[PDB]
Design a protein around this ligand. Structure first.
Ligand SMILES: CCCCCCCCCCCCCCCCCC(=O)O[C@@H](COC(=O)CCCCCCCCCCCCCCC)COP(=O)(O)OCC[N+](C)(C)C
Ligand SMILES: CCCCCCCCCCCCCCCCCC(=O)O[C@@H](COC(=O)CCCCCCCCCCCCCCC)COP(=O)(O)OCC[N+](C)(C)C
Ligand SMILES: CCCCCCCCCCCCCCCCCC(=O)O[C@@H](COC(=O)CCCCCCCCCCCCCCC)COP(=O)(O)OCC[N+](C)(C)C
Ligand SMILES: CCCCCCCCCCCCCCCCCC(=O)N[C@@H](COP(=O)(O)OCC[N+](C)(C)C)[C@H](C)O
Ligand SMILES: CCCCCCCCCCCCCCCCCC(=O)N[C@@H](COP(=O)(O)OCC[N+](C)(C)C)[C@H](C)O
Ligand SMILES: CCCCCCCCCCCCCCCCCC(=O)N[C@@H](COP(=O)(O)OCC[N+](C)(C)C)[C@H](C)O
Ligand SMILES: *[C@@H]1O[C@H](CO)[C@@H](O)[C@H](O)[C@H]1NC(C)=O
Ligand SMILES: *[C@@H]1O[C@H](CO)[C@@H](O)[C@H](O)[C@H]1NC(C)=O
Ligand SMILES: *[C@@H]1O[C@H](CO)[C@@H](O)[C@H](O)[C@H]1NC(C)=O
Ligand SMILES: *[C@@H]1O[C@H](CO)[C@@H](O)[C@H](O)[C@H]1NC(C)=O
Ligand SMILES: *[C@@H]1O[C@H](CO)[C@@H](O)[C@H](O)[C@H]1NC(C)=O
Lengths: 75, 496, 75, 495, 495, 75
């Protein structure tokens, strides 16, 4: 699939808008938030799981966010 | 209707009825004592009256483009083409000064509108439950050659087979199988295809069976069935760098290929004024209390046989062969058996051709006989004395290996069907009645927590659960995670 | 875009191949393997960040794996 | 060639100055005893482009054929396998007595379909010696507002120059009449990194794409003038083996998917020569031969009137267009900015060095631009009873000015990298050590966080801030906070 | 069909017996009240062979073309790469102004050479149903020396039967005239594991080879009747590039290297069908219908003489030929083996059971062969004046003979594996359970050392012996010693 | 075919000599000869490393033989 592999920010200096800059914020997050909205139970189980294998409050939230981001990607 | 050259079939021992789950392109053979062995299969399923639920654009076109411009600090530009429905409009801002037009320097607002036309669209339709139409084939083994075993123009002409339609209006039907009697079946078309979690999506000439949520979530300009105005049109448009008097708009190229990539995992169907697909399942119940043996009083054939067609493995630990009979006498039983050795000629195997016979009186008849020998070395024996002919057969497997294979087939059948898999070959009983009721709650608890997930994600989550359960304490939360991680890995590897 | 929001496995009980089953293994991992191959430096920083976050070896490797997964997917 | 009416405008202040002409920016230079200078890169042109690779984003299947085989023969071989334009796959079907085999199991089939490409996306490469920059230089002399942007007239006044900078002509000096000579030497080779860009053409759309992204693109591709495609099965679907004939279907047009993949590429023009209004170009501007007029005309004594009233430019400068009624030859224009109408001492900075009526005609229009101070001031034109006093309020403060210039400096460092230290540089030691440190840090930073998009930069930076705050070594904490701050800046700045 | 002079002969001893008919061996059955039986597997045959793969071992290169591209103008694409009979490779060469280029660097070349296979080795597969074992059965009746081995006489005497055993006819009964009926029932599927072999025909030499070794060959190959070769670049060599023309040379015939790689493959003969003479076949032979000859004649009255002196068969049995002077029709011979001439108690069991003269004509030669006991003994014919004696010494002992029997059984167990437990088997609980425990530890050992060679086996056996003799645990130090013993046995077995 | 892909002993019950059975002793050990002869110094150094990698005197012999067999096999 070609559309999944995206030419990112061009290294060329540019005081203008690139090819699709209206979707710069959305394109990296639309599918993740959509999948989360369709799968609340995974959100809850990931929150619960991030507490299990942590060791303090600092590094449990990191686990929770990492799990919440790694599942919507790779479907 | 018939399943001989078919890769995947299941075998079901008999007491007066049995319920089965006819899967997509598999078959079932039902052996019973003092019954003809019969095979049943769901050939296809159909929808006929589909009503549109949505359309999605994937090739859009911009017709005419206008830009209304205002000087800096004069407010916001407003294109009058915002009052017309077929126009997509966006507000940008461009540099303005004395060289551009105006008397003040700075960021002056502009409003650009482009006329939106849709060239090609993908149409999503739905199925009403009262229009699913299963085609089901049933066949009685009888006495067939190899050039009529799957014809069905001879099996129907010998009252040994039937294709019939199952509809929610008429979930049950009886088939007259000649001297074998009657075979009845009542199905569950309502509990067949879910038909309420699927759309039929047509893209050009390619039709797919898509999920409802996925079809509802496409990022494409969509519209109501009969309507013509579109929503979310800006997905297919690009407004380039703003210009004071002329900012251009380009329609993006056809998203048909991107849509095809998105359709990965959809089930291709063949919409030809009626949806026809050969997958899914249908849970039925077959009655064979009116099914009797044919020719219980023929007697044995007297003259010699031959191997008109060599014994062949079928892949399901079963053998098939074809005997030519030199006898000119009428119908007669075939004296054929499977023995451990040509000395001590006792039968040790069970035959699924259900008391074969030479149904004709004309000589040189050809009869297909199909039987299941045991593991190890066996002999196919037909005839006696000087006329006895023999064939050495070998079966490679073992009983424990077969048990493991059956266990994994059952595990992946539960994976495929979930709860209806508990109705596969059931005869009632509290065991299945409670296994279904516990699989329902466990499947709900598992599906609210791991539905909508791909094999990589579930495999990694299961591996993490194994790691955690090994490190788990209290031995009570440990086993729960061990089971869940085992299930996730089994699911992740079941498709590769 | 719509290619990233793939359909996924069909809930229907099937034994034929689905629409693009020849990519059932590839498409999920193609972008990630390309990104790792073409940004080999990020592997080092993910390794060190995981080895520093994790209290123990298992926590460390879990951090490393999720870090190596969530970066090439949202980039 | 001059920048009046541009939102991107910079201001610079022993005899040469290092500038970085950006894409849509402009530079104004105001020296000690020199006329004001406007310098800008306008357009970049590449003239001879060599094709490298063409990707197919639309294919069609013509003639499909299948050969079946029994499990007693091994794999099958379709005769059309020996033809260039055919894609062939080896599938497996179910075989038994019904189909015509002798045994049961899985038989081999080979299916070949024709592959014609319909639309290809051509990729082209840039040679550094074919790169042209277009540079415009202008001296603030005597112009009306409409003439201020006209090159056909600024050339006639010897107040402007449009010239092409190439590797074979890296330095140009342009005649400027009575102001002297203005020179530039530039390094075109360092300007546009041709060894990292391609010009992909998708129909009538042309982009400037990274080479590493273009090469990894997953489509059937062919070499220039080859017409033999590779990895064609990307646009093909072999489906449902049938043991008699298996249907093969081409996928839809990839043009929409291609445009979605191109999200981030810089669009360019292509009319046998690629045009581009982005990128940068480092130059050194030489004013030593440049000077002021050397004579003064004497004050204009007739009445003045505002042909166009004072207008803010958005750059803390005020522009207006006077109209001189009298016709008494060239004369010096009485105009200034004062704190009050009692102390007429000028207080601001004059962008137009010494305004004067160039012609000897009535109603002559002259554009004058000033740099008033923050607060309240008065534009005074004329003296005596012909005087015009125009109150002017410049909003803001010098502290806010410093803060906004710091933000601009950070953004120039992000967008330009190392040449950001060559901006307004005069060869200071501080610039040299800063630039040398910047290479060694922006190599290490870029080799690690180079392929990261803004969202993952933001997440990584926030994690780095957290870890550095929780870091104890007090030196890994310092550097980790530094890198995290850079990541947050790069993530938030582009939004 | 016949067994005398065999050098590989076995002897056996309530109505059937289970035997393994090894390819180059013979079995002699000596039941209580039955004639002596000679059973042997003469040859295995296979009639219908289907090709699975052809390996090229001699190629040819005819037309070589090289296209070249400047160091940074793309990658060279040879037009003939469109064609399929051409092997193409891409290389890099030094390029500069000396060379046609405009830039100095590494230019690209694409070289294509036409490929042509001269000689191929074809691998065919045997269908198990087309395997037939040729089996010879023989009754030890009255034979001369010139007839004991002539089939066109033993058949004429209703004394031997040579029959075909297929999967479609695993059993057969042989008419033996006055001796009754001998019946045999075999397992023609377990004999030759056709699922693990191929017939490779390299030149006029044909070999029975393993499947995995055939599938691991590194040579260009095709599917049957395909001619679309692959891995063609194994047989080609590309010399150093020259940017205008490169040389491609085919490596010489791999027939010799293929013969070397076939070291250990079993030669066969494949004129029109495959004829093997090795292998084994498992058959139960039943004798219930086999009767001792119904004889109405008495002892011969006239004199006997040694028409051919007693001779030692290498299996502790004597053979001699008697001459009959009389002409009194059929008559039984009064031959015996005794311990001394003063006491004529018969002590040596006869193998030519109930010897007799067949024809009524004088000067009849009769081959009689016997099994005397260890030590000294005497062969006596007749009585009184007509008596003739022959002293015979049988060197060895029963206690020693047990050692040879045990080592020969161990060699059989190595060669046959599991079917070795069916040799000389008559029902039994110990024999069946031994076969069962030999299923396990027969494949359990195989999956660990199946692919080894004799030297690897020997080194592994020595190392296991060392670790076992050092091992503290007696439970693990016995299994490891057992594997060390069996591995060294299998190593020394080849010698 | 490449002659290092040696068919080896056949699993068929055989009593003749197979193809080239005169070389069974040689072809599996002939290459190690004409290499140790040409490289005695390697034998010396292999003995030296065997004597120092083995904690036990019964480990030195195993290491030395393993080295003297593994080096010639890979040239
Ligand atoms: C001291 C006493 C200890 C007692 C221990 C008892 C432990 C027994 C637990 C065994 C559970 C094994 C169940 C595995 C079945 C897997 C079936 C399968 O294929 O997965 C199903 C679902 O599998 C499950 O969810 C199975 C149930 C979860 C596991 C239950 C664990 C219960 C543990 C009990 C522990 C008791 C401890 C008591 C201590 C005193 C797939 O989903 P479906 O709903 O069928 O839908 C199919 C469609 N799709 C493919 C898209 C998913
Ligand atoms: C006084 C007490 C002792 C402790 C002293 C500690 C000293 C720490 C100093 C840390 C300095 C870090 C400097 C990082 C520079 C990173 C620059 C970079 O990434 O370059 C980018 C530009 O990035 C930036 O502009 C980031 C600048 C970050 C600067 C951070 C400075 C931190 C200073 C810390 C001060 C220490 C305080 C000490 C007191 C405790 C240019 O990339 P290119 O590859 O050239 O071009 C491509 C352009 N682009 C990536 C944008 C697509
Ligand atoms: C304390 C309680 C009493 C325990 C009594 C134990 C008695 C066990 C006796 C075992 C004797 C085994 C002798 C085997 C002779 C056969 C020839 C041979 O050695 O060759 C075998 C060697 O292979 C085997 O290992 C299989 C032979 C059977 C081995 C059975 C060993 C059983 C040991 C039991 C240990 C007892 C433990 C007691 C615990 C208290 C080759 O057979 P395959 O592998 O089938 O042939 C294919 C390979 N090739 C091409 C090279 C021919
Ligand atoms: C105090 C002590 C407490 C004791 C606790 C006891 C806990 C026991 C829990 C055991 C649970 C095991 C469940 C899995 C077993 C394997 C089943 C299988 O997958 N295999 C099935 C498949 O059959 P089919 O697919 O043909 O039919 C499908 C229909 N069917 C599934 C109803 C049979 C069978 C055996 O072949
Ligand atoms: C007891 C302990 C005491 C501790 C003391 C702590 C002191 C901390 C002081 C830190 C101040 C750092 C400010 C640097 C801002 C950089 C942004 C920037 O480049 N901006 C420049 C002007 O930007 P330009 O647009 O001209 O860009 C080109 C300018 N260039 C060529 C110089 C790069 C100035 C600095 O703003
Ligand atoms: C304090 C108390 C201590 C007491 C300990 C005493 C231990 C002594 C026990 C020794 C018994 C060893 C016997 C087994 C080894 C010989 C195996 C062998 O291969 N030999 C066979 C020759 O069989 P064939 O191949 O001719 O026929 C085929 C028949 N078959 C398939 C059954 C083998 C026989 C048995 O010899
Ligand atoms: C605008 O598009 C509509 C259809 O969307 C079409 O009927 C109409 O002609 C177009 N108008 C113009 C001005 O092109
Ligand atoms: C079935 O047999 C009939 C002859 O009775 C023949 O006409 C028909 O073609 C056959 N059908 C198939 C599918 O073989
Ligand atoms: C520039 O000035 C010339 C000379 O008066 C005039 O003819 C022309 O219209 C002007 N061109 C532009 C660019 O406005
Ligand atoms: C190339 O070789 C092919 C066979 O592989 C042969 O038929 C053909 O004649 C050759 N081409 C030339 C050199 O004309
Ligand atoms: C066998 O005996 C026959 C007698 O019919 C004789 O003709 C022939 O030469 C003999 N054959 C052999 C092989 O010695």
């Amino acid at each position: 699939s070609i559309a999944v592999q995206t030419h990112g920010e061009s290294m060329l200096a540019n005081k203008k808008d690139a090819w699709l800059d209206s979707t710069k914020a959305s394109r990296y997050l639309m599918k993740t938030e959509n999948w989360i909205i369709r799968n609340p139970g995974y959100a809850f189980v990931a929150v619960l799981l991030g507490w299990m294998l942590g060791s303090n409050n600092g590094q449990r939230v990191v686990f929770v966010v990492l799990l919440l981001l790694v599942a919507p990607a790779y479907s | 209707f018939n399943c001989l050259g078919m890769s995947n079939r299941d075998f079901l021992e008999g007491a007066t009825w049995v319920d089965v789950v006819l899967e997509g392109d598999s078959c079932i053979t039902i052996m019973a004592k003092d019954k003809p062995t019969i095979d049943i299969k769901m050939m296809e399923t159909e929808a006929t009256n589909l009503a549109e639920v949505r359309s999605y654009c994937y090739l859009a076109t911009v017709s005419d483009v206008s830009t209304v411009s205002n000087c800096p600090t004069t407010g916001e530009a407003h294109n009058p083409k915002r009052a017309e429905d077929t126009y997509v409009c966006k507000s940008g801002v461009t540099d303005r000064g004395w060289g551009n037009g105006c008397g003040l320097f700075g960021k002056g607002s502009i409003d650009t509108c482009a006329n939106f036309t849709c060239s090609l669209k993908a149409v999503g339709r739905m199925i009403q439950p009262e229009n699913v139409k299963y085609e089901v084939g049933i066949f009685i083994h009888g006495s067939t050659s190899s050039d009529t075993h799957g014809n069905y123009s001879s099996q129907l002409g010998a009252s040994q087979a039937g294709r019939f339609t199952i509809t929610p209006n008429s979930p049950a039907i009886t088939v007259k199988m000649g001297d074998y009697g009657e075979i009845s079946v009542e199905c569950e078309p309502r509990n067949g295809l879910n038909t309420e979690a699927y759309y039929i999506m047509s893209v050009g000439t390619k039709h797919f069976l898509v999920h409802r949520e996925w079809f509802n979530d496409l990022a494409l300009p969509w519209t109501s069935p009969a309507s013509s105005n579109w929503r979310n049109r800006e997905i297919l448009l690009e407004f380039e760098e703003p210009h004071a008097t002329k900012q251009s708009v380009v329609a993006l190229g056809s998203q048909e290929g991107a849509l095809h990539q998105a359709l990965a995992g959809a089930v291709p169907v063949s919409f030809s004024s009626s949806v026809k697909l050969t997958s899914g399942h249908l849970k039925c119940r077959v009655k064979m209390e009116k099914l009797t043996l044919k020719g219980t009083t023929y007697g044995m054939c007297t003259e010699k046989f031959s191997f008109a067609k060599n014994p062949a493995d079928t892949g399901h630990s079963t053998v098939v062969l074809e005997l030519q009979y030199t006898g000119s006498d009428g119908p007669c039983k075939i004296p054929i058996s499977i023995v451990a050795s040509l000395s001590d000629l006792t039968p040790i195997g069970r035959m699924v051709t259900a008391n074969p016979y030479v149904a004709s009186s004309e000589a040189n008849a050809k009869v297909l006989v199909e039987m299941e020998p045991p593991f190890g070395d066996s002999y196919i024996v037909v005839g006696r004395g000087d006329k006895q002919i023999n064939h050495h057969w070998h079966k490679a497997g073992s009983s424990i290996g077969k048990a493991f294979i059956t266990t994994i087939k059952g595990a992946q059948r539960l994976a495929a069907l979930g709860d209806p898999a508990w109705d596969f070959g059931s005869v009632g009983g509290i065991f299945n009645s409670v296994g279904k009721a516990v699989h329902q709650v466990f499947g709900g608890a598992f599906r609210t927590l791991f539905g909508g997930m791909s094999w990589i994600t579930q495999g990694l989550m299961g591996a993490l659960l194994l790691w955690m359960g090994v490190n788990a304490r209290d031995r009570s939360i440990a086993l729960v995670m061990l089971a869940t991680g085992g299930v996730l890995l089994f699911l992740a590897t079941s498709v590769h």
